[PDB]
């Protein structure tokens, strides 16, 4: 569970996927803005055992 919600884990995953590599335009500043948007596309919601 700790690795799932980690900001670091989401960053390393996108850098090695072909989905992200074909979307790089070649400008250093633009790629960083694009990458930060992808990190927020994954959301983790913790559960509660009281409500099952």
């Amino acid at each position: 569970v700790m690795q799932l919600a980690s900001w670091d884990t989401r960053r390393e995953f996108w850098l090695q996927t072909d989905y992200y590599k074909q979307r790089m335009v070649g400008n250093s500043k633009a790629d960083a803005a694009l990458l930060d948007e992808m990190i927020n596309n994954i959301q983790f919601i913790p559960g509660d055992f009281t409500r099952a």
């Binding site: 700790m2 980690s6 900001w7 670091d8």
Partner: protein
């Protein structure tokens, strides 16, 4: 009379009697006299989100 004199001589040249618990403490005390080994520059944390 004679062997009674012998008893005094034998116990005189032996000394006090020690049990097992005395010997264990002396062996442990030898390690404590060596002293601890101090190595600095060891980490006290780990990263879940590296600064960027």
């Amino acid at each position: 009379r004679p062997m009674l004199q012998a008893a005094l001589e034998n116990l005189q040249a032996v000394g006090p009697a020690f049990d097992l618990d005395y010997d264990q403490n002396r062996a442990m005390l030898n390690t404590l006299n060596v002293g601890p080994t101090l190595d600095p520059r060891f980490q006290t944390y780990r990263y879940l989100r590296t600064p960027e």
